[PDB]
Amino acid sequence: KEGLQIGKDEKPIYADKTYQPEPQVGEESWTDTDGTNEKFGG
Amino acid sequence: EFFDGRDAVAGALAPEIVLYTENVNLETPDSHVVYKPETSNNSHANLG
């Protein structure tokens, strides 16, 4: 309910609405191969 | 190596692509890799 989880610490860390998600970042390689019900934010 | 399509159930098995696999003295004499995910080699992630 709190947005895009961006890591773990058990306790899941959530995106800070002030700056996350960064418009300047994304997937790193062209071989994403993403079809398995992924979670995306912007 | 020979390849066929997607259905190719029992008898409709006729090759459509024939690839001549080989081994070469591959080398990169004037360039370096700037992005490589995994330290190991020959993985789907290493295609990119």
In Å, what resolution does this model reach?
A: 3.2
User: Do A40 and A19 meet the contact criterion of CB atoms below 8 Å apart?
Assistant: no
- Cβ–Cβ below 8 Å for A28 and B37: yes
* Distance from the Cα of residue B46 to its chain's centroid: 11
* Interchain CB contact of A31 with B (< 8 Å): yes
* Interchain CB contact of A33 with B (< 8 Å): yes
How many whole angstroms separate alpha carbon B38 and alpha carbon B45? 7
Look-up of token digits 């690839």: B19
Ramachandran region of residue B47, left (φ > 0), alpha (ψ -120 to 50) or beta? alpha
**Alpha carbon separation from B18 to A6, A34, B21 (Å, rounded):** 45, 29, 9
Long-range contacts made by residues B27-30, C-beta under 8 angstroms, separation at least 24?
A: none
By C-alpha distance, which of A39, A42, A40, A4 is closest to A23? A42
**A vs B: CB pairs below 8 A:** 12
| Resolved by | cryo-EM
φ, ψ of residue B46 to 5 degrees: the values are: -85, 0
Chain A residue at shortest CA distance from B36: A29
